[PDB]
Paper text:
TGF-β protein monomers are biosynthesized with an N-terminal prodomain of ∼250 residues and a C-terminal growth factor (GF)3 domain of ∼110 residues (3–5). However, the GF remains strongly noncovalently bound to the prodomain, which keeps it latent during storage in extracellular milieus. The structure of the pro-TGF-β1 dimer reveals that the prodomain dimer surrounds the GF dimer. TGF-β cannot bind its receptors and signal until it is released from the prodomain (i.e. activated).
We introduced an R249A mutation into the RHRR249 PC cleavage site between the prodomain and GF domain of human pro-TGF-β1. We determined a crystal structure to a resolution of 2.9 Å of human R249A mutant pro-TGF-β1. The structure contains one monomer in the asymmetric unit; the other monomer of the dimer shown in the figures is a symmetry mate. In the uncleaved R249A mutant 2.9 Å structure, we can trace the electron density for the polypeptide chain up to prodomain residue 242. After seven prodomain residues and the N-terminal GF residue missing in density, the trace of the GF begins with its second residue, residue 251. Residue 251 is present in the solvent-filled cavity between the arm domains and the GF in the center of the ring-shaped pro-TGF-β1 dimer (Figs. 2A and 3 (A–D)). Eight residues (positions 243–250) linking the prodomain to the growth factor domain are missing in density, consistent with the need of flexibility to fit into the catalytic site of the PC protease. In the human R249A mutant pro-TGF-β1 structure, the latency lasso is displaced up to 7 Å by a lattice contact relative to other structures, and two residues are disordered. The R249A mutant is a model for the structure of the pro-form of pro-TGF-β1 present during biosynthesis, after folding is completed in the endoplasmic reticulum, and before cleavage by a PC protease in the Golgi. We therefore concluded that the prodomain arm domain is connected to the GF with which it has no noncovalent interaction.
Residue numbers in the entry:
A (entry chain A), B (entry chain A): 3 to 39, 42 to 61, 72 to 242, 251 to 298, 311 to 313, 319 to 361
Write the structure that this text describes.
């Protein structure tokens, strides 16, 4: 009767809020048209598919998504890196990476994606960044699960691509090689090579044809680009917006407590400010709520025995509207 | 005049909220006493110090903090692992680990801590978990920064310690060994050993005397223990508390939009419910706000050229009170 509609009304409220959320995120005053193009082309479907199932691991405005495939194997130059059975090389032309992203500042997230298909043994791999000529800098670690069905893998390589877009040669790239562990005893050193158990190399990742390694990019488009953990505080913002008000709390002066031996006081902060769609969560009631929270360790005695305990979420480091 | 006091009143409000926050987090109806014990003993000061500067990287109720030093080197057994110049071994007695934590379920966070002092060259290290007898299972990776002043290091080892407390032998431990990289070409294999550049072993980490490797533990005490990313939804909670109401939004039926080619609709969810101190943020205005948020990739045409973009924070996966 009443309550039923009373909730259908609230749902209908956010539908008009999301209608404003999507348009404001796109910097669009009006909904556009369908476009000139039956079914969509497979170049954007593969790009949309690549984005639908994000693996592993947040600006408000929308981000343009583009992918750039690496230069084909047995094409251009593989002369330097021949006969490395346990290492897969990937190289990208910076001219076509700059074609996707006009300026390094626009890039917000870049992730290299590969296609693994092995199902029997796990593979421990490593990722390296090329420096100068044939000098390699370690990036990240990754273990591979024995999945019968192929699953995509991603590597967060944003900071590297931003340096590539800004300067350096036109040919930059990565190197996915096997992880080894070595423990030495009594003048004898054992090397346990892990990952790339099959010498074919083509058994671990897909390197020929379509579905080859590419570099997925997420950047702000240039039309949007115009205008547009770090602590936030109310004095530095110079605005009435939601911020962090610092409040030192003494246990002796404020709470009147004497039982906490350490610390004598701590910087408990709180949020404050009104949240006003052109002016992020698009909820039915935006609030000034904290985002970042640190714990607070304290010391006190319980009878004869002291206790050192940590209280979670006692200090506010950053607020936000939602 | 007015506004000044009007803000001092709000600050005084949260002081009584934090007064309830700290006591409710400790399950204390009243503030306790100072205790039987001038300056505090150095055993809890080192334990309080260990907690004050947490490095690297959230239950509501307080967590008991205890540390357990590893068995002394050149003491008990080091016979098996002698002459491993690039590997530091650490072993803990499970009887005294069970002395700190009575049941594996109580343990919420465990972190092994070491003391590094090198300043010249960076050290790339690895961490391993002992399996059976002299079988090692990789845990995590870590690079070490050349700091002139010593800095503490931590390793999240919670899942391992919980398995140790539940079953297994009484002597379990870890192994911190150097990371090596190996790239093979033309029947020649190069091994670049990184970390532990000095053969002294005692140059990288502190292994004798006090400030030796210990295992920091954070668990719920047994007196508190009685009673007390996974998606949350309003139908499953069976309560009026703040939860997630699912709402499928069709672009054709609800928004009337036809320009988004893919997807045809998405599961935009919203938060709802009243937040009621015995009944987490302890702010001046608790709100039902979302915690987990996923992006939403969409596809649409701009004139002749299509665009595939991702909109951040469009789907709500979990709400919370703050
Ligand atoms: C990208 O992912 C989409 C789905 O997210 C894939 O779309 C799929 O395309 C196939 C066409 O080969 C569809 O099969 C069709 O099934 C219907 C029955 O529903 C049948 O009548 C048709 O004759 C055809 O067999 C499939 O349904 C469709 N997936 C979904 C969920 O509708 C697409 O193929 C992927 N593209 C790439 C390049 O990975
Ligand atoms: C654990 O950390 C605490 C600080 O977080 C350390 O407390 C420090 O203890 C020394 C005593 O050796 C204090 O020095 C004192 O300075 C005052 C002047 O303020 C002087 O009058 C005294 O004669 C003495 O020299 C030092 O101030 C104090 N730190 C602070 C911030 O007050 C403690 O030593 C650490 N313990 C361990 C085991 O690491």
């Amino acid at each position: 009767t009443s309550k039923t509609i009373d909730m259908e009304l609230v749902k209908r409220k956010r539908i008009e809020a999301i209608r404003g959320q999507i348009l404001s995120k796109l910097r669009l005053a009006s909904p556009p048209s369908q476009g000139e193009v039956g079914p969509l082309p497979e170049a954007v479907l593969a790009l949309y598919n690549s984005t639908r199932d994000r693996v592993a691991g947040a600006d408000y405005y929308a981000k343009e998504v583009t992918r750039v495939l690496m230069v084909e194997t047995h094409n251009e130059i593989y002369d330097k890196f021949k006969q490395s059975t346990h290492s897969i090389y990937m190289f990208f032309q910076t001219s076509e990476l700059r074609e996707a992203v006009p300026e390094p500042v626009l890039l917000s997230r870049a992730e290299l994606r590969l296609l693994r298909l092995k199902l029997k043994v796990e593979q421990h791999v490593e990722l390296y960044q090329k420096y100068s000529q044939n000098s390699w800098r370690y990036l990240s670690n990754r273990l591979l699960a024995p999945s019968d069905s192929p699953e995509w893998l991603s590597f967060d390589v944003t900071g590297v691509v931003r340096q590539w877009l800004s300067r350096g040669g036109e040919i930059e790239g990565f190197r996915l090689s096997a992880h080894c562990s070595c423990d030495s005893r009594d003048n004898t050193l054992q090397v346990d090579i892990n990952g790339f158990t099959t010498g074919r190399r083509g058994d671990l990742a897909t390197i020929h044809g379509m579905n080859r390694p590419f570099l997925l990019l997420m950047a702000t488009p240039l039309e949007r680009a115009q205008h547009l953990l770090d602590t936030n505080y109310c004095f530095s913002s110079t605005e009435k917006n939601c911020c962090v008000r610092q409040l030192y709390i003494d246990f002796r002066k404020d709470l009147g407590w004497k039982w906490i031996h350490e610390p004598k006081g701590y910087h408990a902060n709180f949020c404050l400010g009104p949240c006003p769609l052109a002016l992020p969560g698009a909820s039915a009631a935006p609030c000034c709520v904290p985002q970042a929270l640190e714990p607070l360790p304290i010391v006190y005695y319980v009878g004869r025995k002291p206790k050192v305990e940590q209280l979670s979420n006692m200090i506010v480091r950053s607020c936000k509207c939602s």
